[PDB]
Design a protein around this nucleic acid. Structure first.
Lengths: 197, 106, 135, 189, 171
RNA sequence: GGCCAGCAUCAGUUUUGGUGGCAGGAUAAAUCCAUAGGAAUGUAGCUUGCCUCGGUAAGUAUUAUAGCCUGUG
RNA sequence: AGAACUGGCGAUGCGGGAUGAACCGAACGUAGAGUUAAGGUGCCGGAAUACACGCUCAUCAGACACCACAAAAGGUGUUAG
RNA sequence: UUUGCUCCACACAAUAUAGAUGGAUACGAAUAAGGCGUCCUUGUGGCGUCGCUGAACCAUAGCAGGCUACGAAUUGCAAUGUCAUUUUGCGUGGGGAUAAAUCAUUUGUAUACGACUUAGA
C-alpha cells in the first residue's frame, strides 16, 4: 500500500523472492531491495559454485564482449534472476525494470526507512531445517566480487548508529508507557474498551 | 478531514488473454484489499474510472476520465473483469484506476 | 558445582488433554481437546462444550493452546464434557491475552460507522490528556 | 520412517559446569575451559539435573538420529578433555638419518621443525595450535608429547607431524621412516 | 479417491438346470456404486465361470463404519503387481475407519512402490484387536503409555504479500 | 423532435449467494441412555529398604476416590 | 524396400505439444454473452507460492505422450517388504 | 553596447508524465529460538509477560474545511468536477560574477584521413 517498498533481503530465497518482485514491479509497485549480499539460495555452496562456473562458460565465441555478461555482484545476480522473469525486451518490461533498485548493504537514503519481509520467500519458512544453503555474498566473493569487505565495514558502522537510535527510542516508549497507564483507568478508556479499542 | 475519497484504488493489470492471444475488450482489475472471489462479489457492477491528463483543455479542464464497470470475478484471488466504453489503451498496464461505489446495495 | 544453565524451549506439545483452537473448516474458531494421537500428522479431537463434533483432524487445521487438562487416553464425549467443565477450560482460556485479542478483533469488525466515529472522538479526548501528561 | 523422540544423555562430573544456550556449549572444569558450537544440528538440550544433561532430537529419521550420538560423543570428549586432559605420545622411526626435531620461536606461533629426515635439506615446519603443549620424554629420547584439552586440536597436531614426514616416490613398504603416534590417553591418569 | 465400502451380492443368471444358483458376496472399497459393480464382476470372473452378461447383481449396500470415532490398528494384507512379477505385502495402519485406512494404503503404495490403483488388490483388512500383534515399528511407536511430542518448527501462513516483522517459529 | 447516459419495471440467455420443505439408506452409522461380559498402554485400594498423606520401585486388584472395549435394547 | 484396414496430411485454418504438413482437442460466414475440450495455474503468461499422504539432495538431479538417445552390471545411499 | 550570463522572490503563459490525493511508521541476531518489563549474587543470570499476523500504530469532525471567541440551498436525482511535479519562456525588483574552445599557422614523442602531442598576442 506504500508508494515505495523497501525489502530487507536477508534470509530470502533468490528465485522465490524474484518471482514476487517481478510480479509486483509489473503490477506497478516501486520496489527497492536493500541488503542483497545476505540473500540465501538453496542447494549446497559447491553446487551453486558449479552452476555459476557453468554460467561462466557461455560467452560468444567470435567476440566475447558481445556475449552473456556474467555480473559478479550479489545485487546483479538478483537482478539477473528478476530480469529472467520480466519480459525485458519490450517497453512494458523495460518500464517495469526501472521501478527496481537493488543495493548491497543499506545506502543512506534507506538507512532511516522501514524495511519489510516477504514471508513466501524466507529461507526459514520455506526450507527444511537441516538442508544446506548458500549465501550470495560468499558465492559472489568466490566467483570474483571485490567489495565484500567494504560492505561489511560499512554495515557495522550503520548497525552501531541503528542500535544507538533504538535505545533512545526504546527509552522514549518506556517513558510513554509509564505515563499512558495513568489514563487507562478513566471513563474515556472504560468507554473505549467496549468498542474493542 | 485530510481525506476526501469515496473510491477504492485498484490497478489495471492486463487485458483478458490466453497465452499468445489477448482480447482488448475485457480488462483485468486488481482491487487493492480483495483476496477471494467471494468478497470480490461485492464490487460487481460498480463503476470504474481511469483518470488521466492531457494538454488540450477540452470542456474547461485538462484531465479526462475513461468510464467503465466491473462485470464478473476472475480466477481465485480477487481479480475482477471490467468493461469500458472505449477500452483501456494498454499503456495503463500497471496504472491506478478508481472503483467507485455508485450502484450500491448497502 | 555452579548451576549448568541449559534451557532451550518450552514447547506446547500435543498430548492427551491438550486444548487446541480450530482455525479451518466448519468449526473454525472453536476450542476442542485432543483425545488420542492417530499418527504424527493427525489427532482425534472432541470439544463438546462449544458444539464441535468428535473428529479425526490433521494438525494443520488446529492451533495448539498453552493450557491443558488431565483426561484419560481415548475418552468419550460425555467424559470430555465432564472434565472440561471440571477444569473450567472456557474460563481459563477467556482470561488469556490470546482470547482477549481475538474478541477485540471480532469486536472491531462489527462496528458501524457511528461506532467508528465515536471511537475517533473518544480517542482524540484520550490523547489530549495523554500528550498533556507526558509534556 | 521418522521416529518420535530419540534421546541420549551426558553425565557431568563434579567441579564441571556445562553452559548451553542457542547450541553453543561451554564446558568449564579443572583443566580449564572448552567451547564448541553445535549450531549446525537441530537438537535440544535439557538440564534434567546438575549431575547429567539430556539431549534429544524429535522426528529426525535416521540422520538426526545418527548425528545425535556424534553430538553426545563430542560433548563427552570435551568434558573428558577438561576433567582429564588429552595426551598424545609420538615416536621417531628412522633407519639411517637422525630426525633432529626442535621447537623454534618464529615471529608468530611456536613452530616446531624436523631436520635430516632421510637426509633432506628441506626444513619441514608444523604450525601448532594455541591449546597444545609440546614436550620431550626423559627416559626415551625418540618421543614427543602433545597435550591439551581439545582432542581435535591435539590429534590434528599429532597428525600434522606424520603428514609431513611422508616418503615420496619410494616404496612405503620398504621405507618405514617418520614420526608415528604410539599412545593416546590422558594427562591426569 | 473419496473411498466408500460396498457390499455387493451377485449371482449367476437362473436356468432350468439350476433355478436357484449360488449367491456370492464381496466387500469392495471403491468410489461409487458403478465402479463398485465393475470391481465386483472383475473379481468374480477370477473365481467363477460367470460374466456380466451371464450374471446379475442382487444387492449393493454401503457399509458405514461401526464406530467411526475410535482409533483402530488395521492390518492390511494386499497383493500388487510391480514391474517384475507380483508380490504380497502386509501393512499396519492406525486410522479410525476402514475407508480411511484403505485411502492411506492406496496413497503410500503409490508413493513407495509406484503402484497405481489398477495394480493393487486388497486381500484383507482386519482390525488388530489388541496391542500385542501389531508388529511394525511405525505403529508400535505410537502405542506407548503417555505419548507426547512437540512440533518444533511452526510455519505461520502468510495472508498478505509483505510482512513488517521477522516471523518467529516457536510454538 | 432526436443522439449520449442514469434509474425503475419487464422479457431472453447466463452467473453467484442466502434460506425453507420433503424422500431414501442398517428407516444412515454415530453420539447419548440402560444392561451383560471383558481386558490393559491397569484406575482406586492392598503388599511394598528410606520415603513425597501409598509417590518414585514392581507386584496384586477388572471400577473402586478415573476410564475404556465388546455384545444386546 | 514392398503390402492389408482405418484415420489424416496433400486441399486445413483454430486452441495445445516453446517452434514442426502428419500427434492431442476441434474442423472455419460476421459479431456479442456464457461454458468447455486438449493443455495448464511461481514469474515470463491468462489461472491455487491450493489442499492431502509419501519419496528424492544428484561435484553433468528431475520435470507434458509422439519426441527429439539409452542398456547390461553394480552402490549395508535411503525407504518399504 | 547591466541588449549578454547566473542565483533569488513571485506575477503569469506553454509542454510532458510507465501513473501521488491521509502516513515508505528505521535495532541487530537466532528460528531445536526470541521481544519487552523488573530485580540482581552483571550472567550464555532470576522472575513476570507477549506472540498465534500490520485485522496494527499514528493522524482523522470544521464552506477541499469559513467568520465570530452566523454561513454553506438553485453544481437542480450521478457525469474526475480540476488542488499534485518536473522542464521552459516572459515580466518586475534584489544580489552576484567578467571566459574559453575550434578552424587557420606551427611541432613531430603522433600520423592513411580525422585524431594525438607541442608552440604562438
Amino acid at each position: 500500500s506504500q508508494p515505495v517498498v523497501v525489502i530487507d533481503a536477508k534470509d530470502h530465497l533468490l528465485g522465490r523472492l524474484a518471482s514476487t518482485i517481478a510480479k509486483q514491479v509489473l503490477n506497478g509497485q516501486k520496489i527497492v531491495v536493500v541488503r542483497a549480499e545476505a540473500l540465501n539460495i538453496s542447494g549446497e555452496f559447491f553446487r551453486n559454485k558449479l552452476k555459476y562456473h557453468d554460467f561462466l562458460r557461455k560467452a560468444t565465441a567470435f567476440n566475447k564482449t558481445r556475449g552473456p555478461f556474467h555480473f559478479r555482484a550479489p545485487s546483479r545476480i538478483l537482478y539477473k534472476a528478476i530480469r529472467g522473469m520480466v519480459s525485458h525486451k519490450t517497453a512494458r518490461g523495460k518500464a517495469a525494470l526501472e521501478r527496481l533498485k537493488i543495493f548491497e548493504g543499506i545506502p543512506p537514503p534507506y538507512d532511516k526507512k522501514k524495511r519489510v519481509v516477504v514471508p513466501q520467500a524466507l529461507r526459514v519458512l520455506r526450507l527444511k531445517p537441516g538442508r544446506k544453503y548458500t549465501t550470495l555474498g560468499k558465492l559472489s566473493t568466490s566467483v570474483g566480487w571485490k567489495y565484500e569487505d567494504v560492505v561489511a565495514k560499512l554495515e557495522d558502522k550503520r548497525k552501531v548508529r541503528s542500535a544507538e537510535y533504538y535505545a533512545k527510542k526504546r527509552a522514549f516508549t518506556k517513558k510513554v508507557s509509564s505515563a499512558s497507564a495513568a489514563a487507562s483507568e478513566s471513563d474515556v478508556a472504560k468507554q473505549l474498551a467496549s468498542f474493542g479499542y | 478531514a485530510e481525506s476526501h475519497r469515496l473510491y477504492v484504488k485498484g490497478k489495471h493489470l492486463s487485458y483478458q488473454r490466453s497465452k499468445r492471444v489477448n482480447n482488448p475488450n475485457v480488462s483485468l482489475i486488481k482491487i487493492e484489499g480483495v483476496a477471494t472471489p467471494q468478497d470480490a462479489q461485492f464490487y460487481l457492477g460498480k463503476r470504474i474510472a481511469y483518470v488521466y491528463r492531457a494538454s488540450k483543455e477540452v470542456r474547461g479542464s485538462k484531465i479526462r476520465v475513461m468510464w467503465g464497470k466491473v462485470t464478473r470475478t476472475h480466477g481465485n484471488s480477487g481479480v475482477v473483469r471490467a468493461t469500458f466504453r472505449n477500452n483501456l489503451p494498454a499503456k495503463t498496464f500497471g496504472a491506478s484506476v478508481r472503483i467507485f461505489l455508485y450502484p450500491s446495495n448497502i | 558445582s555452579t548451576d549448568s544453565i541449559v534451557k532451550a524451549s518450552n514447547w506446547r506439545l500435543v498430548e492427551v488433554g491438550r486444548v487446541v483452537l480450530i482455525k479451518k473448516g466448519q468449526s473454525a474458531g472453536k476450542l476442542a481437546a485432543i483425545v488420542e494421537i492417530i499418527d504424527q500428522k493427525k489427532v482425534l479431537i472432541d470439544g463438546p462444550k462449544a458444539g464441535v463434533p468428535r473428529q479425526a483432524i490433521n494438525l494443520g487445521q488446529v492451533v495448539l493452546t498453552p493450557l491443558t487438562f488431565a483426561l484419560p487416553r481415548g475418552a468419550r464425549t460425555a467424559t470430555v464434557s465432564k472434565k472440561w467443565a471440571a477444569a473450567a477450560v472456557c474460563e481459563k482460556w477467556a482470561a488469556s491475552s490470546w482470547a482477549k485479542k481475538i474478541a477485540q478483533r471480532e469486536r472491531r469488525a462489527a462496528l458501524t460507522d457511528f461506532e467508528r466515529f465515536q471511537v475517533m472522538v473518544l480517542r482524540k479526548q484520550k490523547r489530549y490528556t495523554v500528550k498533556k501528561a507526558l509534556a | 520412517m521418522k521416529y518420535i523422540q530419540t534421546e541420549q544423555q551426558i553425565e557431568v562430573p563434579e567441579g564441571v559446569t556445562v553452559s548451553i544456550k542457542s547450541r553453543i556449549v561451554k564446558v568449564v572444569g579443572p583443566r580449564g575451559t572448552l567451547t564448541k558450537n553445535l549450531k549446525h544440528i537441530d537438537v535440544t538440550f535439557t538440564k534434567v539435573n546438575n549431575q547429567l544433561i539430556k539431549v534429544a532430537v524429535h522426528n529426525g529419521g535416521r540422520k538426526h538420529v545418527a548425528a545425535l550420538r556424534t553430538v553426545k560423543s563430542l560433548v563427552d570428549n570435551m568434558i573428558t578433555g577438561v576433567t582429564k586432559g588429552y595426551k598424545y605420545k609420538m615416536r621417531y622411526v628412522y633407519a639411517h638419518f637422525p630426525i633432529n626435531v626442535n621447537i623454534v620461536e618464529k615471529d608468530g606461533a611456536k613452530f616446531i621443525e624436523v631436520r635430516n629426515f632421510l637426509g633432506d635439506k628441506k626444513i619441514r615446519n608444523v604450525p601448532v595450535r594455541d591449546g597444545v603443549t609440546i614436550e620431550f620424554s626423559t627416559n626415551v629420547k625418540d618421543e614427543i608429547v602433545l597435550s591439551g584439552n581439545s582432542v581435535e586440536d591435539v590429534s590434528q597436531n599429532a597428525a600434522d607431524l606424520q603428514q609431513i614426514c611422508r616418503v615420496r616416490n619410494k616404496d612405503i613398504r620398504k621405507f618405514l621412516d617418520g614420526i608415528y603416534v604410539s599412545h593416546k590417553g590422558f594427562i591426569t591418569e | 479417491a473419496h473411498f466408500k465400502e460396498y457390499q455387493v451380492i451377485g449371482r449367476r443368471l437362473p436356468t432350468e438346470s439350476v433355478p436357484e444358483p449360488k449367491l456370492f458376496r464381496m466387500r469392495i472399497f471403491a468410489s461409487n456404486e458403478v465402479i463398485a459393480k465393475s470391481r465386483y464382476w472383475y473379481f468374480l470372473q477370477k473365481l467363477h465361470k460367470v460374466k456380466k452378461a451371464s450374471g446379475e447383481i442382487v444387492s449393493i449396500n454401503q457399509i458405514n463404519e461401526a464406530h467411526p470415532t475410535k482409533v483402530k490398528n488395521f492390518g492390511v494384507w494386499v497383493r500388487y503387481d510391480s514391474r517384475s512379477g507380483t508380490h504380497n505385502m502386509y501393512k499396519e495402519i492406525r486410522d479410525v475407519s476402514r475407508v480411511a485406512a484403505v485411502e492411506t494404503l492406496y496413497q503410500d503404495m503409490a508413493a513407495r512402490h509406484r503402484a497405481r490403483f489398477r495394480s493393487i488388490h486388497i486381500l484383507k483388512v482386519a482390525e488388530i484387536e489388541k496391542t500385542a500383534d501389531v508388529k511394525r515399528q511405525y505403529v508400535k511407536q505410537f502405542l506407548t503409555k503417555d505419548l507426547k511430542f512437540p512440533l518444533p518448527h511452526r510455519v505461520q501462513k502468510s495472508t498478505k504479500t509483505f510482512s513488517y516483522k521477522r516471523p518467529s517459529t516457536f510454538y
